[PDB]
């Protein structure tokens, strides 16, 4: 297809309008006191929302180019979110802030390669300043505290999160289920999690988490690439009969079999999902076994001559629940009996003895930790379903932000942290005075999130900012109650990871744009 | 269909905008410090890339003519890469530099046939200068060195490449597989390679190498033209049953049978690919046997009365892997037992005794070399799949550029080489003073790739060029570190083959356009 | 359909622009130093070509009328080619030259019928002058020499052509096959050739020669008109089983059966081709027999009551190769045993004894000559297929031009011949001074091909032409080397046939257009 190519100025001027529309729609929602964005929908009434992520998802512009410019910032900002659990809007707001001023700089006749270099030094410096201002959060007291602050002053949540990390380690796998009483429970159970995502965004049955959730499913454990669906049919119908869903863990599922399964859970004929088996090569075939052991299944390997056609219900593994992400599979409560599972831990235990190399040591301590370490489930209780299925999502929110605090501490939440570091590195210089412009661009972009929250509440932004700047450390303005104070004590704090990721990602994409010379896309 | 015909000037003016668009998009990527080109894509976010080959592939203009112009330079520039492993972008950037000044010349009222002749004498001369500046690369030390420089300062790669040529000769067939541990292996195995490509760009399952890769496949060895699919059916279904792919080596596969197999690996019914048997006539029927012996197969020849219908699984040959290119088939690890294979080497050994002619000698020493010489595989090891399936590609890159250094030596990588030879032949004259303009056009074009690199870095091009020019031999500017030095010691070198090819292919196409008088294409 | 009708002037003015487009595009390629024509193509890169026949094939204009104008010249010029083996472009360039000046004359107010008569007198005269200047080429020394000059300085080709004429007579049938070694062979074998072409341009499997080539095929010999396909089915499936192609020689194959076979070799179900049996009436039924005898087949004649349904494989004839043209069928190496073939020659031998009339004599000496005379095959050998399948085509080229020299000698090749004869007849007058205009039109047209070659080389045309004119005999300018000399000795010669055909056919079509008064075509 004939493309349409734009260059240099024109390409960036397009990209800029693009990002402006994405940011201008998504930024108005930033506060605790955001403005509403109305988002049309076909059958029935429009959706009124105060939520950036939701506005952003809907944005897509007519004029390609313009479009790409928004799609681009969208993609980076979403990634902040993927590595944290928040900041998508912040990411966006700041990415606008640099690109606007950066791009305008370049069009002004300044050197892009310098404009960027400056932006990057300012971010580098700010990320240091951030680690400095950051307050560790390591002990059960602080976990629970961040946990409660994040579920919005709910001690009972913080307690639970803190108790689960207490039980399965700060590393341990922790999930959340629907509670069955009024009471919250926290059980620990034989389970496991590994770094593989769904093989198509289509198996997703809960678009809320954008994830797949299966109940009482059988697990197919196959060591080989799966291309033909002919091989599946004997098993896939023994499974539609026991009326339960089924998870495919194989070396891969490609083109044919994959596009088949996808169209088959679309018409809801049989609920199915598939994921690549964990790791690669040699430690893959031993790792697949572990999953088998855990779930009381059998590994179908072509290497001992077994076919997928000669596989009854009985060969398959089984658990009480599984949950798969963009990039995570997690298996909860496997039927595998502790005779076998315990026994297999004793086998691997010993392999660490005869380990001659250090690399060979870790890879085994990682399999013991997955297998014997198990998974902590948190059933959430409440008095009514509307009330409970809500609380659940709020725990999942805090659980997320807590994990990220445990990793890199917490800081002033009002975009305060950002304003703070930016006022600290006001002397920062470069070589080129174009390179200084780049720093002063990035610096001045960091007041963007505060200035915008204030504005969204209809307060003077200039005025609030200047007073947050005149203080120190974690002193800041809480826009929800319009008071100043120590942001952390008033319970308005971001994990540090997220504030930093937001900054870094907004920085990258802005950089990318300042150094774009050409854009290529389809003919209108 | 009615065509639209353009003549002379107009034809050339169209061609020139066409090529300008392709080069202007593609050239901005040239350095190690390229600029970004954003390349839209439908579902999902655009692709940001610094990679010429990728930008080029996307270019296609609306205005046919304009299109042809671009499509023409793209074709030639692609070929440089087919005959080397790099230079696509360099080729394009130089093509643009000649064409621009050339076409402007002819439009100016000078003689195209002279303008060309000049361009060609300059290229001839420069190619000589190049072989002179070229530094041989012959011993294990230098192989490893170019191997490492090419995999980007990775001694462990260079080692391996150098060890494989050590084991199988600088001629020997070398492939790369996916490693299974952390460790890199280098095995030597009963295998072979010959000059035949796939019979349709459709069997390609890995568009990354743009090649076909089959695993544990059966090999059909048929000496006859295959037109009807009726003849295949008995075997093709015995094969879909053993659940493995299948390679067809026959005298040919034509129209019917071909278009059948093509549609059949498209719906992934049976993974299949076919290639013309190697050589022609008499030495064809003997060479097809060699493959059989190697893979423990049987040759189905109509000359002893065997049909393809009367062929069971057992007649077919077999290996552990095969890989087919645009123009190469390579068989790895054949089941053929060294009883038969060794025995067939003893037969051919003897045929060299009774060889009465020299032509009959080589043709046999070539079959021994293919058969007894075997194939060196390099399994690549690493710590994570993302890390390893990467390193693999990077080895494949060096392995390529190594082969081409072994052939014609190496030179200053920064487009330095080019600038050097051009400053050497600044006296070069012709007869027409039109022909002089032609040399000066081509000479000045040779500073294009260096000038452009420096510019992509935001340095003064004029200024760096002039300083590289005032030096000698392989002294040049390394735009990655902004230091001058000897380009080869700083590890920035191109194989000579590629620098030459790039020049020659740019020159060819530019020539062709300067002498185009008419363009014929479909009605808008 | 409603037509659009144009008259008189407008009709011709349309026709003229149409021919100018076809010529202007095709002429630029004329030299040994042509210019390039770029011919777009859909999937992939355009084609750059220096070859007129190629350019012409693609031409087709939007404006019907303008279209006809070009389609007409194309048709005539293509015929020059059919009756020679070259000159298509020449034919075209000359046709333009007359039409341009002729059409201009009539539009000027001169009598078309006189304008024509003149052009015709000038052509008559020039065709005489040409026979005179024609240098004979009759002995083995000259054959070989034209043979080598034509395969482009390759003595080994010339030798072979000259040897085959040596073995089968200057009349004898000669074909060219794919060699199997490095060595060229020249065998003589039981075969035959007759004046019948394919029954549809669709059986063509090698569009390069624009011909059909079948290997180891069965021959069906049927004396009757074949309309229904019902009659074929028993045989056509006995044949698709032995996996070989099949040739139909019948009295005719009409509508139904024909359109069936055509669609059946299109989907490559069974490779088939059909041709009218040779001659007519009585000598047809005897001649069909000869072919049978030659190929060891049986003649299915309705006159003894045999049906096509009652015909097994065994009735059919057979050979090792057959090759069918637009208008030629040639059978190579028939299975028919020399017992029967020799015996049949003794029968016909005798028929010449009892021949009471002269017409009855020749018709029989013609069947003996076809049958006992046999066919000379030339296997072409070389070192590589790319190298050999090429050389083959080059032999075919010389073989062609050689046969045509053997017929009317050779002449100065630079369009020198044309210039010479036209300088000779510069006094030539007619009766109308309109008729004179006509002669001067045609005379002046004959310098076109030289003036054009020179131009395609960027040399003064005027100047070159005037010096070639001042000479005598075959003295001319060789544009490839820019020297003057004796064109034949410098080995730049055309066969006389072609130069004459080119003139005659150009002249016809031009004549036609000057006397056109009306054009009728479909509504845009």
Short mmCIF file of N, CA, C and O in Angstrom, two decimals, chain C residues 389-480:
data_model
loop_
_atom_site.label_atom_id
_atom_site.label_comp_id
_atom_site.label_asym_id
_atom_site.label_seq_id
_atom_site.Cartn_x
_atom_site.Cartn_y
_atom_site.Cartn_z
N UNK C 389 21.63 -22.50 -19.90
CA UNK C 389 20.28 -22.21 -20.36
C UNK C 389 20.27 -20.86 -21.05
O UNK C 389 19.34 -20.52 -21.81
N UNK C 390 21.34 -20.11 -20.81
CA UNK C 390 21.59 -18.89 -21.57
C UNK C 390 22.10 -19.28 -22.96
O UNK C 390 21.39 -19.09 -23.94
N UNK C 391 23.31 -19.86 -23.04
CA UNK C 391 23.96 -20.15 -24.32
C UNK C 391 22.98 -20.75 -25.31
O UNK C 391 22.94 -20.36 -26.46
N UNK C 392 22.18 -21.71 -24.84
CA UNK C 392 21.07 -22.28 -25.60
C UNK C 392 20.31 -21.17 -26.31
O UNK C 392 20.28 -21.17 -27.51
N UNK C 393 19.71 -20.24 -25.58
CA UNK C 393 18.94 -19.16 -26.21
C UNK C 393 19.69 -18.34 -27.31
O UNK C 393 19.13 -18.02 -28.38
N UNK C 394 20.96 -18.02 -27.03
CA UNK C 394 21.90 -17.44 -27.99
C UNK C 394 22.12 -18.26 -29.29
O UNK C 394 22.16 -17.70 -30.38
N UNK C 395 22.29 -19.58 -29.16
CA UNK C 395 22.29 -20.49 -30.32
C UNK C 395 20.99 -20.34 -31.12
O UNK C 395 21.03 -20.01 -32.29
N UNK C 396 19.84 -20.54 -30.47
CA UNK C 396 18.52 -20.35 -31.11
C UNK C 396 18.44 -19.06 -31.91
O UNK C 396 17.78 -19.02 -32.97
N UNK C 397 19.12 -18.04 -31.40
CA UNK C 397 19.15 -16.71 -32.01
C UNK C 397 19.97 -16.71 -33.29
O UNK C 397 19.54 -16.21 -34.32
N UNK C 398 21.17 -17.25 -33.20
CA UNK C 398 21.99 -17.33 -34.38
C UNK C 398 21.36 -18.28 -35.41
O UNK C 398 21.30 -17.97 -36.59
N UNK C 399 20.85 -19.42 -34.94
CA UNK C 399 20.31 -20.43 -35.83
C UNK C 399 19.30 -19.77 -36.71
O UNK C 399 19.35 -19.90 -37.92
N UNK C 400 18.39 -19.06 -36.07
CA UNK C 400 17.44 -18.21 -36.78
C UNK C 400 18.02 -17.27 -37.85
O UNK C 400 17.62 -17.33 -39.02
N UNK C 401 18.92 -16.38 -37.42
CA UNK C 401 19.52 -15.40 -38.32
C UNK C 401 20.34 -16.11 -39.41
O UNK C 401 20.46 -15.60 -40.53
N UNK C 402 20.87 -17.29 -39.12
CA UNK C 402 21.65 -18.00 -40.10
C UNK C 402 20.74 -18.49 -41.22
O UNK C 402 20.99 -18.25 -42.39
N UNK C 403 19.66 -19.14 -40.85
CA UNK C 403 18.74 -19.61 -41.86
C UNK C 403 18.32 -18.51 -42.76
O UNK C 403 18.00 -18.76 -43.90
N UNK C 404 18.28 -17.28 -42.25
CA UNK C 404 17.78 -16.18 -43.05
C UNK C 404 18.87 -15.55 -43.95
O UNK C 404 18.59 -14.78 -44.89
N UNK C 405 20.12 -15.86 -43.65
CA UNK C 405 21.20 -15.37 -44.44
C UNK C 405 21.34 -16.33 -45.61
O UNK C 405 21.39 -15.93 -46.77
N UNK C 406 21.38 -17.62 -45.29
CA UNK C 406 21.31 -18.68 -46.27
C UNK C 406 20.24 -18.38 -47.31
O UNK C 406 20.32 -18.86 -48.41
N UNK C 407 19.24 -17.57 -46.98
CA UNK C 407 18.15 -17.37 -47.90
C UNK C 407 18.32 -16.16 -48.74
O UNK C 407 18.07 -16.22 -49.90
N UNK C 408 18.74 -15.03 -48.18
CA UNK C 408 18.83 -13.80 -49.01
C UNK C 408 20.06 -13.02 -48.76
O UNK C 408 20.15 -11.85 -49.09
N UNK C 409 20.99 -13.67 -48.13
CA UNK C 409 22.28 -13.10 -47.98
C UNK C 409 22.27 -12.21 -46.80
O UNK C 409 21.30 -12.22 -46.10
N UNK C 410 23.33 -11.43 -46.60
CA UNK C 410 23.44 -10.46 -45.48
C UNK C 410 23.79 -9.05 -45.94
O UNK C 410 24.24 -8.89 -47.02
N UNK C 411 23.56 -8.02 -45.15
CA UNK C 411 23.91 -6.64 -45.55
C UNK C 411 24.35 -5.78 -44.37
O UNK C 411 24.10 -6.14 -43.23
N UNK C 412 24.99 -4.65 -44.63
CA UNK C 412 25.39 -3.67 -43.61
C UNK C 412 24.36 -3.36 -42.55
O UNK C 412 23.30 -2.80 -42.83
N UNK C 413 24.72 -3.65 -41.31
CA UNK C 413 23.79 -3.77 -40.19
C UNK C 413 23.38 -2.53 -39.37
O UNK C 413 22.57 -2.60 -38.37
N UNK C 414 23.90 -1.37 -39.74
CA UNK C 414 23.68 -0.29 -38.79
C UNK C 414 22.45 0.49 -39.16
O UNK C 414 22.37 1.66 -38.84
N UNK C 415 21.51 -0.14 -39.83
CA UNK C 415 20.61 0.58 -40.72
C UNK C 415 21.46 1.28 -41.77
O UNK C 415 20.97 2.22 -42.39
N UNK C 416 22.73 0.86 -41.95
CA UNK C 416 23.57 1.26 -43.08
C UNK C 416 22.95 0.82 -44.39
O UNK C 416 22.83 1.62 -45.27
N UNK C 417 22.50 -0.42 -44.50
CA UNK C 417 21.94 -0.91 -45.73
C UNK C 417 20.92 0.15 -46.24
O UNK C 417 21.00 0.66 -47.42
N UNK C 418 20.00 0.51 -45.34
CA UNK C 418 18.87 1.34 -45.72
C UNK C 418 19.38 2.67 -46.27
O UNK C 418 18.96 3.14 -47.32
N UNK C 419 20.30 3.30 -45.56
CA UNK C 419 20.87 4.55 -46.01
C UNK C 419 21.47 4.51 -47.43
O UNK C 419 21.30 5.46 -48.21
N UNK C 420 22.24 3.46 -47.71
CA UNK C 420 22.88 3.19 -49.00
C UNK C 420 21.79 3.17 -50.10
O UNK C 420 21.85 3.99 -51.01
N UNK C 421 20.81 2.26 -49.99
CA UNK C 421 19.90 2.10 -51.09
C UNK C 421 19.15 3.39 -51.40
O UNK C 421 18.94 3.77 -52.53
N UNK C 422 18.76 4.07 -50.35
CA UNK C 422 18.09 5.35 -50.47
C UNK C 422 18.93 6.51 -51.12
O UNK C 422 18.38 7.41 -51.75
N UNK C 423 20.25 6.45 -50.95
CA UNK C 423 21.15 7.35 -51.66
C UNK C 423 21.32 6.99 -53.14
O UNK C 423 21.50 7.87 -53.98
N UNK C 424 21.24 5.70 -53.43
CA UNK C 424 21.22 5.18 -54.80
C UNK C 424 20.00 5.68 -55.55
O UNK C 424 20.16 6.30 -56.60
N UNK C 425 18.78 5.45 -55.02
CA UNK C 425 17.63 5.90 -55.81
C UNK C 425 17.11 7.29 -55.63
O UNK C 425 15.89 7.48 -55.64
N UNK C 426 18.01 8.28 -55.58
CA UNK C 426 17.62 9.67 -55.36
C UNK C 426 17.13 10.40 -56.58
O UNK C 426 16.58 11.49 -56.47
N UNK C 427 17.25 9.79 -57.75
CA UNK C 427 16.59 10.36 -58.92
C UNK C 427 15.17 9.92 -59.17
O UNK C 427 14.38 10.66 -59.76
N UNK C 428 14.87 8.71 -58.70
CA UNK C 428 13.56 8.09 -58.88
C UNK C 428 12.36 9.06 -58.93
O UNK C 428 12.12 9.78 -57.94
N UNK C 429 11.63 9.10 -60.04
CA UNK C 429 10.45 9.98 -60.15
C UNK C 429 9.10 9.22 -60.31
O UNK C 429 9.09 8.01 -60.37
N UNK C 430 7.97 9.94 -60.33
CA UNK C 430 6.64 9.34 -60.57
C UNK C 430 5.87 10.31 -61.49
O UNK C 430 6.57 11.09 -62.17
N UNK C 431 4.51 10.30 -61.54
CA UNK C 431 3.80 11.22 -62.49
C UNK C 431 3.17 12.40 -61.84
O UNK C 431 3.34 13.53 -62.25
N UNK C 432 2.34 12.14 -60.87
CA UNK C 432 1.98 13.24 -60.05
C UNK C 432 3.27 13.76 -59.37
O UNK C 432 4.14 13.01 -59.01
N UNK C 433 3.41 15.06 -59.24
CA UNK C 433 4.32 15.60 -58.25
C UNK C 433 3.80 15.37 -56.84
O UNK C 433 4.55 15.53 -55.93
N UNK C 434 2.53 15.00 -56.65
CA UNK C 434 2.14 14.33 -55.38
C UNK C 434 2.81 12.95 -55.25
O UNK C 434 3.10 12.49 -54.16
N UNK C 435 3.06 12.28 -56.35
CA UNK C 435 3.58 10.96 -56.25
C UNK C 435 5.08 10.98 -55.95
O UNK C 435 5.65 9.98 -55.39
N UNK C 436 5.70 12.10 -56.32
CA UNK C 436 7.09 12.32 -56.05
C UNK C 436 7.23 12.56 -54.59
O UNK C 436 8.11 12.00 -53.96
N UNK C 437 6.36 13.41 -54.05
CA UNK C 437 6.39 13.73 -52.63
C UNK C 437 6.46 12.43 -51.89
O UNK C 437 7.18 12.29 -50.93
N UNK C 438 5.71 11.47 -52.41
CA UNK C 438 5.56 10.14 -51.86
C UNK C 438 6.84 9.39 -51.86
O UNK C 438 7.17 8.75 -50.89
N UNK C 439 7.57 9.48 -52.96
CA UNK C 439 8.86 8.82 -53.01
C UNK C 439 9.85 9.46 -52.02
O UNK C 439 10.43 8.75 -51.20
N UNK C 440 10.04 10.78 -52.07
CA UNK C 440 10.88 11.50 -51.12
C UNK C 440 10.46 11.24 -49.68
O UNK C 440 11.31 11.06 -48.80
N UNK C 441 9.16 11.16 -49.40
CA UNK C 441 8.77 10.71 -48.06
C UNK C 441 9.44 9.41 -47.68
O UNK C 441 10.06 9.37 -46.65
N UNK C 442 9.36 8.40 -48.56
CA UNK C 442 9.81 7.07 -48.23
C UNK C 442 11.30 7.06 -48.23
O UNK C 442 11.94 6.31 -47.45
N UNK C 443 11.90 7.89 -49.06
CA UNK C 443 13.34 7.74 -49.18
C UNK C 443 13.95 8.19 -47.90
O UNK C 443 14.80 7.49 -47.31
N UNK C 444 13.48 9.39 -47.50
CA UNK C 444 13.91 10.10 -46.30
C UNK C 444 13.64 9.26 -45.08
O UNK C 444 14.32 9.35 -44.11
N UNK C 445 12.65 8.39 -45.17
CA UNK C 445 12.28 7.51 -44.04
C UNK C 445 13.32 6.45 -43.81
O UNK C 445 13.42 5.87 -42.74
N UNK C 446 14.13 6.22 -44.81
CA UNK C 446 15.00 5.10 -44.71
C UNK C 446 16.25 5.54 -43.99
O UNK C 446 17.03 4.67 -43.56
N UNK C 447 16.48 6.82 -43.82
CA UNK C 447 17.63 7.13 -43.03
C UNK C 447 17.28 7.06 -41.54
O UNK C 447 18.09 7.34 -40.68
N UNK C 448 16.05 6.75 -41.21
CA UNK C 448 15.62 6.91 -39.85
C UNK C 448 16.35 6.02 -38.92
O UNK C 448 16.88 6.54 -37.95
N UNK C 449 16.40 4.69 -39.19
CA UNK C 449 17.10 3.76 -38.30
C UNK C 449 18.55 4.07 -38.08
O UNK C 449 18.86 4.14 -36.93
N UNK C 450 19.42 4.25 -39.09
CA UNK C 450 20.74 4.86 -38.76
C UNK C 450 20.61 6.20 -37.96
O UNK C 450 21.20 6.32 -36.87
N UNK C 451 19.87 7.21 -38.45
CA UNK C 451 19.95 8.50 -37.74
C UNK C 451 19.60 8.24 -36.28
O UNK C 451 20.05 9.03 -35.41
N UNK C 452 18.79 7.20 -36.00
CA UNK C 452 18.33 6.99 -34.65
C UNK C 452 19.39 6.33 -33.86
O UNK C 452 19.71 6.81 -32.79
N UNK C 453 19.99 5.26 -34.34
CA UNK C 453 21.09 4.63 -33.59
C UNK C 453 22.13 5.60 -33.17
O UNK C 453 22.54 5.58 -32.05
N UNK C 454 22.61 6.40 -34.09
CA UNK C 454 23.58 7.43 -33.79
C UNK C 454 23.08 8.28 -32.62
O UNK C 454 23.85 8.54 -31.69
N UNK C 455 21.80 8.66 -32.63
CA UNK C 455 21.24 9.55 -31.63
C UNK C 455 21.19 8.98 -30.24
O UNK C 455 21.66 9.60 -29.29
N UNK C 456 20.60 7.79 -30.14
CA UNK C 456 20.77 6.92 -28.95
C UNK C 456 22.20 6.80 -28.40
O UNK C 456 22.39 6.27 -27.32
N UNK C 457 23.20 7.27 -29.14
CA UNK C 457 24.61 7.26 -28.71
C UNK C 457 25.09 8.64 -28.45
O UNK C 457 26.18 8.82 -28.04
N UNK C 458 24.26 9.63 -28.68
CA UNK C 458 24.65 11.00 -28.39
C UNK C 458 25.63 11.58 -29.38
O UNK C 458 26.37 12.54 -29.09
N UNK C 459 25.68 10.98 -30.56
CA UNK C 459 26.54 11.48 -31.62
C UNK C 459 25.63 12.28 -32.54
O UNK C 459 24.40 12.03 -32.55
N UNK C 460 26.22 13.26 -33.25
CA UNK C 460 25.58 14.07 -34.28
C UNK C 460 24.88 13.12 -35.28
O UNK C 460 25.56 12.28 -35.76
N UNK C 461 23.61 13.17 -35.63
CA UNK C 461 23.13 12.18 -36.59
C UNK C 461 23.39 12.63 -38.01
O UNK C 461 24.18 12.03 -38.69
N UNK C 462 22.71 13.65 -38.49
CA UNK C 462 23.22 14.50 -39.61
C UNK C 462 24.71 14.23 -40.05
O UNK C 462 24.99 13.81 -41.16
N UNK C 463 25.66 14.47 -39.15
CA UNK C 463 27.04 14.24 -39.46
C UNK C 463 27.35 12.80 -39.76
O UNK C 463 27.94 12.57 -40.77
N UNK C 464 26.94 11.84 -38.93
CA UNK C 464 27.25 10.46 -39.22
C UNK C 464 26.58 10.13 -40.51
O UNK C 464 27.21 9.63 -41.40
N UNK C 465 25.32 10.45 -40.68
CA UNK C 465 24.60 9.97 -41.85
C UNK C 465 25.28 10.47 -43.08
O UNK C 465 25.62 9.70 -43.93
N UNK C 466 25.52 11.76 -43.16
CA UNK C 466 26.19 12.28 -44.33
C UNK C 466 27.52 11.58 -44.71
O UNK C 466 27.78 11.41 -45.89
N UNK C 467 28.35 11.17 -43.73
CA UNK C 467 29.55 10.42 -44.11
C UNK C 467 29.23 9.01 -44.54
O UNK C 467 29.75 8.60 -45.51
N UNK C 468 28.32 8.30 -43.90
CA UNK C 468 27.98 6.97 -44.39
C UNK C 468 27.45 7.04 -45.79
O UNK C 468 27.65 6.13 -46.56
N UNK C 469 26.78 8.12 -46.12
CA UNK C 469 26.22 8.32 -47.45
C UNK C 469 27.31 8.55 -48.45
O UNK C 469 27.24 8.03 -49.55
N UNK C 470 28.30 9.33 -48.11
CA UNK C 470 29.32 9.54 -49.11
C UNK C 470 30.14 8.34 -49.55
O UNK C 470 30.98 8.50 -50.41
N UNK C 471 29.90 7.17 -48.98
CA UNK C 471 30.69 5.99 -49.26
C UNK C 471 29.97 5.17 -50.30
O UNK C 471 29.10 5.69 -51.00
N UNK C 472 30.35 3.90 -50.43
CA UNK C 472 29.67 2.95 -51.30
C UNK C 472 29.49 1.56 -50.68
O UNK C 472 30.05 1.28 -49.67
N UNK C 473 28.71 0.68 -51.27
CA UNK C 473 28.69 -0.71 -50.83
C UNK C 473 28.30 -0.89 -49.40
O UNK C 473 27.43 -0.20 -48.95
N UNK C 474 28.95 -1.75 -48.66
CA UNK C 474 28.60 -1.85 -47.27
C UNK C 474 29.42 -1.08 -46.33
O UNK C 474 29.73 -1.57 -45.29
N UNK C 475 29.77 0.14 -46.68
CA UNK C 475 30.63 1.00 -45.85
C UNK C 475 29.71 1.68 -44.93
O UNK C 475 28.69 2.12 -45.38
N UNK C 476 30.06 1.81 -43.66
CA UNK C 476 29.11 2.32 -42.72
C UNK C 476 29.79 2.73 -41.46
O UNK C 476 31.01 2.58 -41.33
N UNK C 477 29.00 3.26 -40.53
CA UNK C 477 29.48 3.67 -39.22
C UNK C 477 29.13 2.57 -38.22
O UNK C 477 28.03 2.07 -38.21
N UNK C 478 30.08 2.14 -37.43
CA UNK C 478 29.77 1.17 -36.42
C UNK C 478 29.59 1.99 -35.15
O UNK C 478 30.63 2.46 -34.61
N UNK C 479 28.35 2.16 -34.66
CA UNK C 479 28.11 2.96 -33.47
C UNK C 479 28.70 2.40 -32.22
O UNK C 479 28.96 3.18 -31.29
N UNK C 480 28.87 1.08 -32.13
CA UNK C 480 29.43 0.53 -30.89
C UNK C 480 30.87 1.04 -30.67
O UNK C 480 31.30 1.28 -29.55
#
